[PDB]
Amino acid sequence: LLWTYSTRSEEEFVLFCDLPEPQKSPHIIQDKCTLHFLTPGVNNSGSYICRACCVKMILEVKPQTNASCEYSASHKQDLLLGSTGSISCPSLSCQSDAQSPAVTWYKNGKLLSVERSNRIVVDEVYDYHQGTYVCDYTQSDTVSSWTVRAVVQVRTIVGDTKLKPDILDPVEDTLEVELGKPLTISCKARFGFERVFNPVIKWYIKDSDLEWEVSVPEAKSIKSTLKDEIIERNIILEKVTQRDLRRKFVCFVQNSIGNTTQSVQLKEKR
Amino acid sequence: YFGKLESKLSVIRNLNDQVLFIDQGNRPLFEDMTDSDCRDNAPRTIFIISMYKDSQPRGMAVTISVKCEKISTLSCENKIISFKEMNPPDNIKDTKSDIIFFQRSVPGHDNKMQFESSSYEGYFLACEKERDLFKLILKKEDELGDRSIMFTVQNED
Amino acid sequence: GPESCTSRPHITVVEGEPFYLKHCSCSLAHEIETTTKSWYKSSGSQEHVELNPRSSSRIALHDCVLEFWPVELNDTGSYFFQMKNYTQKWKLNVIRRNKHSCFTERQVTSKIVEVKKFFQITCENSYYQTLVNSTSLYKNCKKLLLENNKNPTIKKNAEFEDQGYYSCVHFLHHNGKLFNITKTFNITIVEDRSNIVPVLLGPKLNHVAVELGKNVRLNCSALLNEEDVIYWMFGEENGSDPNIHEEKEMRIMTPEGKWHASKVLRIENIGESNLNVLYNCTVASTGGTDTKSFILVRKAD
Ligand SMILES: *[C@@H]1O[C@H](CO)[C@@H](O[C@@H]2O[C@H](CO)[C@@H](O[C@@H]3O[C@H](CO[C@H]4O[C@H](CO)[C@@H](O)[C@H](O)[C@@H]4O)[C@@H](O)[C@H](O[C@H]4O[C@H](CO)[C@@H](O)[C@H](O)[C@@H]4O)[C@@H]3O)[C@H](O)[C@H]2NC(C)=O)[C@H](O)[C@H]1NC(C)=O
Ligand SMILES: *[C@@H]1O[C@H](CO)[C@@H](O[C@@H]2O[C@H](CO)[C@@H](O[C@@H]3O[C@H](CO)[C@@H](O)[C@H](O[C@H]4O[C@H](CO)[C@@H](O)[C@H](O)[C@@H]4O)[C@@H]3O)[C@H](O)[C@H]2NC(C)=O)[C@H](O)[C@H]1NC(C)=O
Ligand SMILES: *[C@@H]1O[C@H](CO[C@@H]2O[C@@H](C)[C@@H](O)[C@@H](O)[C@@H]2O)[C@@H](O[C@@H]2O[C@H](CO)[C@@H](O[C@@H]3O[C@H](CO)[C@@H](O)[C@H](O)[C@@H]3O)[C@H](O)[C@H]2NC(C)=O)[C@H](O)[C@H]1NC(C)=O
Ligand SMILES: *[C@@H]1O[C@H](CO)[C@@H](O[C@@H]2O[C@H](CO)[C@@H](O[C@@H]3O[C@H](CO)[C@@H](O)[C@H](O)[C@@H]3O)[C@H](O)[C@H]2NC(C)=O)[C@H](O)[C@H]1NC(C)=O
Ligand SMILES: *[C@@H]1O[C@H](CO[C@@H]2O[C@@H](C)[C@@H](O)[C@@H](O)[C@@H]2O)[C@@H](O[C@@H]2O[C@H](CO)[C@@H](O)[C@H](O)[C@H]2NC(C)=O)[C@H](O)[C@H]1NC(C)=O
Ligand SMILES: *[C@@H]1O[C@H](CO)[C@@H](O[C@@H]2O[C@H](CO)[C@@H](O)[C@H](O)[C@H]2NC(C)=O)[C@H](O)[C@H]1NC(C)=O
Ligand SMILES: *[C@@H]1O[C@H](CO)[C@@H](O[C@@H]2O[C@H](CO)[C@@H](O)[C@H](O)[C@H]2NC(C)=O)[C@H](O)[C@H]1NC(C)=O
Ligand SMILES: *[C@@H]1O[C@H](CO)[C@@H](O)[C@H](O)[C@H]1NC(C)=O
Ligand SMILES: *[C@@H]1O[C@H](CO)[C@@H](O)[C@H](O)[C@H]1NC(C)=O
Ligand SMILES: *[C@@H]1O[C@H](CO)[C@@H](O)[C@H](O)[C@H]1NC(C)=O
Ligand SMILES: [Cl-]
């Protein structure tokens, strides 16, 4: 069995052991006898053995010159939760689907008997539809009728948010502080999921028209879920003094929708 | 420890839109009903979903009841579904309970609901076709994507 | 194969439609012995007249069913089945057909579908499936162009244009006469009804300074949904405390349709027991929970 891999700017690949009885079932990762190849180029090509019964695999790699069509499928695909989605084979997208050229699909190793077309059309998408999808099809030449393997990674995602972010911490518009002591105020903000995500979380200091920008320290994603993302960024005062009372410390946060601010006025515990 | 918070009048339905109801045999069943039939078959079709506080929070703690003649609460005791002749309790002096369920939305499907038992973890309220009728049973999560454990809760809010 | 018995006690049907009544405890398995099955009808105060199995009449009694070819306005009444160690009843109510239409208003099954989310109409029938000649789909009583097989279906991501009444008709022939079974769905499309996973504002652990004798007002705010509940836990299991009062929650809706809820815990005449003990506040949703703890520490620490 000889499989071909037509690489580009960014992709992935796998080679699983095929045998009559599912008895059990290098810098590149290995899991459940299914050896995976990450970021190769022109290197990862040749014969690979797995084991009396011996599963022979003669891999081949070559770079793709250019896309045969305008709407050439991605190797990273997104299925919206609760709607109708499709998992199209990148290696067979530009030919559309005149007649399915013997397409076999594999979701996380397991074969998909029903799906044999250029596309897997998922009627109603649920979280479990997520996974590594491998579309295989045989293409003949002079003597060898080698198979073509393409690996599409699909994720189940919720539609992009229609809401601006939320400042979790701080809440109170004031703060009891003792002068001559250090202070580190923390800004915690929750960001609704977006396909293209460019969040903003920064502190700034203002005294009427006067404004000072804080750049250090770096922001930190504390939690990332399906619906939201929490990022945190501190402000450090090595020694709070009388001047730090004349001004307000405002945390700024913004996503593709808009911005929300929480300004804290410092007061002494006294 | 559970503490009864509040209730809502709801109509529970499966994903093939079959209305949940308590028959004369006093057993919880599923059946195809027109809006008219569902209305005309009340109070059997209208359920009292009561929310509870939890000493160890782990999702929406809930009780499911029906006021046919008197109020009856849903029990999953001995992994078997039944309607016990009782009003939702004001307090439950235990971490786990045969009448308390965790009402949880399915990822990305915010209006589809799943009820896991607080007493038997891994087991959920589900609709299973047994012979000539659709029973409301309690079954262990066997395979990913099981749509028989999903439901829709139409509130009177 | 099998078929759902009519378990529901009250049944509404429209005149001129072939309708049936199937009793429960019906097992047609080869091991099952034959037995005497009786069907009776009641009209008004009391009747209890045994149903007539006349020579190919409008009413057909066989196996487990009471078929009607078709139901008419005068069929409304109380029906009863009797068997060895088994008795079932139903309250049949047959409503008038909307003649100046294709479907009757009352026999509608409403469904609300979210925009850009999977929408489907599957025109199926299994009981009368063997007798069905042709099947059609109607949007506001206007026929739909399709492949129109034994079951014409719709399968698309919902759009406000899909809102409407979908009459699903099944034409069949019964020993010469043509009948039809019509089942209409009242589909109404509605804008993103997506919920937020609730969250408590502020840090997860709070040390709230105070000295004995005085009172505290622990405030717990939450970003939640409309239907979500916010509560406090302070040892109700050990009995009731007459110094801890849970004030009525406050709710506001942010211009962008965001709900904020605030509930405060009043702790009157702080004693040594009220110290170094975790007073938890939590949010509860169908889509998640979040908990916050408030420890009462002496002002002297
Ligand atoms: C499923 O099966 C049922 C029967 O079980 C069928 O029901 C019949 O359907 C028709 C139409 O829905 C019923 O309505 C009758 O319509 C007549 C007028 O329709 C014509 O004229 C208008 C003019 O504007 C046209 O638009 C239209 O296309 C028609 O050409 C009315 O005249 C009838 O009213 C009364 O007067 C007549 C005499 O003129 C009497 O004979 C009638 O009895 C009645 O008193 C009436 O409104 C008809 O009533 C239904 N019959 C029965 C027995 O219920 C369904 O059509 C069928 N489903 C499908 C999809 O075919
Ligand atoms: C994949 O697609 C990319 C485009 O997205 C493609 O890149 C283009 O390659 C061609 C060559 O194959 C480039 O064009 C040539 O550029 C050289 C200078 O670098 C010129 O000397 C050439 O001029 C001659 O030919 C012209 C056209 O016939 C004549 O008009 C002229 O008088 C000269 O005789 C010629 O213009 C082109 O610049 C790139 N463009 C980009 C954006 O990369 C790439 O080659 C494709 N892959 C493969 C393997 O073909
Ligand atoms: C108030 O809340 C505390 C803490 O509760 C925990 O933290 C919150 C922020 C949430 O994440 C909660 O979901 C979570 O329960 C309650 O006390 C804590 O309870 C947990 C669960 O019973 C204890 O964990 C166990 O500890 C034992 C012994 O170490 C282990 O063997 C177990 O594996 C398990 O981890 C935890 O120890 C306990 N912590 C404290 C500080 O007591 C507390 O009961 C509650 N109070 C009231 C009045 O409701
Ligand atoms: C098809 O489904 C829709 C709902 O999706 C039903 O429409 C609803 O009908 C009522 C009719 O009264 C509408 O008005 C309401 O009336 C009450 C009367 O007490 C009043 O208090 C309310 O303020 C309101 O005005 C309601 O707005 C309407 N909703 C929508 C979204 O259309 C319709 O009845 C269903 N059809 C059938 C045949 O069942
Ligand atoms: C759908 O029905 C037609 C017509 O059926 C006739 O009319 C009915 C009201 C009832 O009286 C029936 O018994 C009649 O047969 C079917 O068309 C007939 O097909 C046969 C061959 O199968 C042919 O010999 C007849 O001439 C046809 N009748 C007419 C009026 O032309 C048709 O086959 C049915 N289709 C399906 C898919 O069930
Ligand atoms: C943050 O959001 C505010 C609005 O809430 C933005 O303010 C607007 O700015 C435009 C100019 O870009 C003005 O025409 C509007 O009048 C402003 N609105 C108000 C109410 O002041 C602000 O620009 C945003 N900031 C950033 C950094 O994007
Ligand atoms: C509990 O805290 C919340 C949040 O700080 C308070 O609620 C809001 O306070 C802001 C102050 O800027 C007002 O603009 C809002 O209108 C308030 N909203 C609500 C829903 O109340 C709340 O008042 C605090 N309660 C107590 C008693 O301290
Ligand atoms: C294989 O070749 C690629 C360049 O195409 C290189 O980056 C990689 O390090 C090589 N791997 C090994 C194992 O030599
Ligand atoms: C009921 O209505 C039908 C209409 O076709 C009629 O044939 C039948 O005789 C009526 N039955 C009685 C008891 O009047
Ligand atoms: C009568 O039927 C019920 C079930 O409906 C069964 O439990 C009972 O044992 C039966 N009794 C006899 C005498 O057959
Ligand atoms: Cl959010």
Author numbering:
A (entry chain C): 30 to 54, 102 to 127, 138 to 356
B (entry chain A): 1 to 157
C (entry chain B): -2 to -1, 20 to 318
Lines quoted from the article behind this entry:
Interleukin (IL)-18 belongs to the IL-1 superfamily and was first discovered as an interferon gamma (IFN-γ)-inducing factor in sera from mice with hepatitis stimulated with Propionibacterium acnes and lipopolysaccharide1. This proinflammatory cytokine is secreted by various types of cells and strongly augments IFN-γ production in type-1 helper T (Th1) cells and natural killer (NK) cells following activation of NK-cell cytotoxicity; thus, it plays a critical role in inflammation and the host defense against microbes. IL-18/IL-18Rα/IL-18Rβ ternary complex formation juxtaposes the intracellular Toll-Interleukin-1 receptor domains of IL-18Rα and IL-18Rβ, to which the adaptor molecule myeloid differentiation factor 88 (MyD88) is recruited presumably with the aid of TRAM6. We determined the crystal structures of IL-18, the IL-18/IL-18Rα binary complex and the IL-18/IL-18Rα/IL-18Rβ signalling ternary complex at the resolutions 2.33, 3.10 and 3.10 Å, respectively.
The IL-18/IL-18Rα/IL-18Rβ signalling ternary complex is formed by IL-18Rβ binding with the lateral portion of the binary complex. On ternary complex formation, the IL-18/IL-18Rα binary complex structure essentially does not change; the root mean square deviations (RMSD) for the backbone Cα atoms are 0.41–0.90 Å compared with the asymmetric unit (ASU) molecules. D2 and D3 of IL-18Rβ are close to each other and directly associated with IL-18/IL-18Rα, while D1 does not contribute to ternary complex formation. The IL-18Rβ-D2 convex surface with the key Tyr212Rβ aromatic residue fits into the concave surface jointly formed by IL-18 and IL-18Rα-D2 with a 613 Å2 buried surface area, which is shallower than that in the IL-1β complexes. The concave surface area is divided into Site III on IL-18 (354 Å2) and part of IL-18Rα-D2 (259 Å2). Site III of IL-18 comprises the prominent β8-β9 hairpin and β11-α2 loop, where the aromatic ring of His109IL-18 forms π-π stacking with Tyr212Rβ at a 3.4 Å distance, which is surrounded and stabilized by multiple hydrogen bonds. In addition to these interactions, IL-18Rβ-D3 extensively contacts IL-18Rα-D3 with the buried area ~550 Å2, to which both electrostatic and hydrophobic interactions contribute. Notably, the NAG-NAG extended from the IL-18Rα-D3 Asn236Rα and points to the receptor C-terminus in the binary complex; however, in the ternary complex, the NAG-NAG chain changes direction and points to IL-18Rβ-D3 within the distance possibly to form electrostatic interaction with Val257Rβ and Asp259Rβ. As a result, despite the same ‘left’ binding mode, the spatial arrangements of the subdomains in the IL-18/IL-18Rα/IL-18Rβ ternary complex differ somewhat from IL-1β/IL-1RI/IL-1RAcP with Cα atom RMSD values of 6.64–6.73 Å. Our data show that IL-18Rβ-Y212A did not bind the binary complex, which is consistent with the structure, wherein substantial π-π stacking were observed between Tyr212Rβ and His109IL-18.
